[PDB]
Amino acid sequence: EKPKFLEYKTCVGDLAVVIAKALDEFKEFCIVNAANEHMSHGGGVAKAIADFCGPDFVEYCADYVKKHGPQQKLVTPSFVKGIQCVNNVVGPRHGDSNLREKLVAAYKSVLVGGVVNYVVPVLSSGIFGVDFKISIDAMREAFKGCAIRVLLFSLSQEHIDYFDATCK
Amino acid sequence: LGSVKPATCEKPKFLEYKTCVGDLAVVIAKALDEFKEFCIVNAANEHMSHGGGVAKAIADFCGPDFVEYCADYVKKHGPQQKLVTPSFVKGIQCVNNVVGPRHGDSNLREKLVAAYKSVLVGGVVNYVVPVLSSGIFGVDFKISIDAMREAFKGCAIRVLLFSLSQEHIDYFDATCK
Ligand SMILES: Nc1ncnc2c1ncn2[C@@H]1O[C@@H](COP(=O)(O)OP(=O)(O)OC[C@@H]2O[C@H](O)[C@H](O)[C@@H]2O)[C@@H](O)[C@H]1O
Ligand SMILES: Nc1ncnc2c1ncn2[C@@H]1O[C@H](COP(=O)(O)OP(=O)(O)OC[C@H]2O[C@H](O)[C@H](O)[C@@H]2O)[C@@H](O)[C@H]1O
C-alpha cells in the first residue's frame, strides 16, 4: 500500500487539525518537524509538535543531543498512535547561505526507510523567514519520482495557494 | 554472569508478535511507544565490532559508552557468542548481542534455533528482534524466521520482529496463517 507515485494533499491550519486530517486520510504517517540543530522545540511547529507529542518526546530529543551533539536530522518516537515517528529536519535560516540547494537537501532528508506517508510543514518559512516559494519549489524538486504521499501544511493560506499554483 | 534489572511490565498471557519494516530509528520509535521497556537484540560478530548491518546502526544509536563497553569487555574476556550489555538509552533495558550462524554452516537450522533461544534475558518480557543471520551472514531469511518461531513457541513474551526488508516481514505474516 505504497502509492504508485507521488501523491500530494494540503492543509491550512494549526497542527491539531492537520494531524486529525492526516490520521483520517493516511491512517499512519511520519510527521516532519521544522527543527533547529539543538532540537530545542521552543516555537513555531516545533513547539506545537513538542506540546502534542509530550515530555517523552521533548526528553528523547534533549537526551539525544546531549549524547550525540547537534543534529541536522533526527528521527524520533512520536508517542502518539498513528504517528510512526517524528522526523526533525533542520532547514536553512535567512542569510543563509545558499537557500535552494539547502532546502532540497532538507526535504530529501525527510524520507525515512519503512515510511510512505509524510506530513510536512513549509520548512524555513516561519520563525526565520526564508521565502516560502523557494522552500516549496525545493520540496517539489526533492520529492520528484518518489512513491510517497505528502500532506503539505502551513498556517498561511498563501503558502498552499502557491503550492496549488503548480498542482493546478 | 548476573541478571538484568527486572521489567516493570508484566509478561503477557501468551506469546505476542508485532512487526516493523524500516530503519532502526523507525523500529525503536514504534517499540518505545508500544513497550514501555524492552531488550533490543543485535545481530553481532564474536568480536562485537559492529562494523556493518544492524550492528553498526545499533552501535551508532547507543553511542560511544556502548561502543566502549563492548570493546572493553571483549578486550578482557575475549570473543563472545552472546553479550548482554547496557544500552545507555532510556526504555532499553539492555542490548543482547547474539552471534548467529552463517551460510553453509553445518546443522544450520538447529544453530538458528539456539541463537533465538539465547535472546531471552531473565526479567525481560519485551524484545525487539532482527532477522538474525539474514544480512551479511548470508542465511535464507525464511529459515531464520522459522527457527525464531520454533525457539519462542510457548514463551510468555512480546516480540517485535524487524527488518529493512518488506519481504521478510511479509513472510512472517504468512507463518501466522
Ligand atoms: N540500519 C538498520 N535498521 C534496521 N534493520 C537493519 C539495519 N541494517 C540491517 N538490518 C536488518 O537486520 C538484519 C540482520 O542483518 P545484518 O545486520 O547483516 O546481520 P547478520 O546477517 O547476522 O550479519 C552479522 C553481522 O553483520 C554486521 O557486520 C555484524 O557486526 C556482524 O559482522 C536483517 O533483518 C536486516 O534487514
Ligand atoms: N502551530 C502550528 N501548526 C501548524 N503549522 C505551523 C504551526 N506553527 C508554525 N507552523 C508552520 O510551520 C512551517 C515552518 O514554520 P516554523 O515552525 O516557524 O519553522 P522554521 O521557519 O523552519 O524555523 C525553525 C525554528 O523555529 C522553531 O523555533 C524551531 O525550534 C527552529 O528553531 C510554516 O509553514 C508555518 O506556517
CATH number at residue A6: 3.40.220.10
CB A11 within 8 A of CB A151: yes
Q: What is the DSSP string of A130-155?
A: --HHHHHHHHHHHHTT---EEEEEES
Can you tell me the distance from the alpha carbon of B156 to that of B173, in angstroms, rounded to the nearest whole number?
20
Pairing relationship of beta strands A83-90 and A73-76 according to DSSP bridges: antiparallel
- Give the per-residue SS3 of chain B: CCCCCCCCCCCCCCCEEEEEECCHHHHHHHHHHHCCCEEEEEECCCCCCCCCHHHHHHHHHHCHHHHHHHHHHHHHHCCCCEEEECCCCCCEEEEEEECCCCCCCCCHHHHHHHHHHCCCCCCCCEEEEECCCCCCCCCCHHHHHHHHHHHHCCCCCEEEEEECCHHHHHHHHHHCC
Most informative mutation of B40, B74, B136, B144 for ligand 1 (most atoms within 8 A of CB) = B136
CB contact under 8 A, B88 and A67: yes
C-alpha span between A13 and A156 (Å, rounded): 8
Of B22, B26, B90, the CB nearest to A63: B90
Contact criterion met (CB < 8 Å) for B25 and A76: yes
Q: Find the CB nearest B33 among A67, A78, A113.
A: A78
| Total number of domains in chain B | 1
Task: Inspect the interface and report whether the beta carbons of B33 and A115 lie closer than 8 Å.
Answer: no
Counting every residue written for chain B, the total comes to 177
DSSP letter string, A35-73: E-TT----SHHHHHHHHHH-HHHHHHHHHHHHHH---SE
Euclidean distance between CA atoms B74 and A130, whole angstroms: 51
**Among B120, B126, B118, B170, residue whose Cα is nearest residue B145:** B170
Residue B158: count other Cβ atoms within 10 Å of its Cβ: 21
Type and span of the H or E element at A98: none
Residue B43 CB–ligand 1 contact under 6 Å: yes
The ligand placed nearest to the CA atom of residue B140 is 1
If you ran DSSP here, which 8-state letter would residue A28 be given?
Answer: S
Residue among B39, B29, B45 nearest B9 (CA) = B39
Rounded CA separation A128/A157 (Å) = 18
Q: For chain B, state the CA radius of gyration.
A: 15
Contacts of A114 in chain B (CB under 8 A): 20-23, 26-27, 164
Range of A28's domain? Answer: 1-168
Give A101's contacts (C-beta < 8 A, 6+ positions apart): none
Tell me the chain B residues in contact with residue A80 when contact means C-beta distances shorter than 8 Å.
33
Q: Decide: residue A5, CB within 10 A, 0-12 exposed, 13-18 middle, 19+ buried.
A: exposed
Between CA B111 and CA A129 the distance in angstroms is 59
Amino acid in the structure at residue A9: K
Please return the burial class of A98, using the count of CB atoms within 10 Å of its CB with bins 0-12, 13-18 and 19+. exposed
Which strand (E) or helix (H) includes residue A11? strand A7-12
Q: What are phi and psi of A150, to 5 degrees?
A: -130, 125
CB A162 less than 6 A from any atom of ligand 2: no
Distance from CA of B19 to the nearest CA of A (A): 12
DSSP-assigned letter for residue A117? E
How many Cα neighbours within 13 Å face the side chain of B122? 5
Beta-bridged to residue A94, according to DSSP, are: A96
Out of A56, A60, A112, the one facing B22 most closely (by C-beta) is: A112
Resolution in A: 2.0
CA distance linking residue A135 with residue A115, whole number of Å: 22
The residue with cell 529536519 is A89
* Pair B141, B174: CB distance under 8 Å: no
Angle, CA B144 vertex, CA B141 and CA B145 arms, to 5°? 85
For A117, what's the count of Cα atoms within 13 Å in the CB-facing half-sphere?
16
Give the other-Cβ count within 10 Å of B117's Cβ. Answer: 15
The β-bridge relationship of strands B92-98 and B82-85 is antiparallel
| Residues of chain A with a CB closer than 8 angstroms to some CB in chain B | 56, 59-60, 63, 67-68, 75-81, 84-86, 112-115
Q: What gap in Å lies between CA A167 and CA B176, rounded to an integer? A: 43
Question: Of all atoms in ligand 2, which is nearest to the CA of residue A122?
Answer: 34
Look up residue A164 and give its DSSP letter. H
- Match 574476556 to its residue by C-alpha cell: B77
Strand order in the sheet with A149-154: A7-12, A149-154, A117-121, A29-35, A83-90, A73-76
Mutate which: A39, A75, A87, vs B, most B CBs within 10 A: A75
Experimental method: X-ray
CA A40 to chain centre: 16
Question: Which grid cell sits at B148?
Answer: 525464531
Q: What chain A residue is nearest to B163 in terms of C-alpha separation? A: A114
Burial class of residue B17 in the structure, from the number of CB atoms within 10 Å of its CB (0-12 exposed, 13-18 middle, 19+ buried):
middle
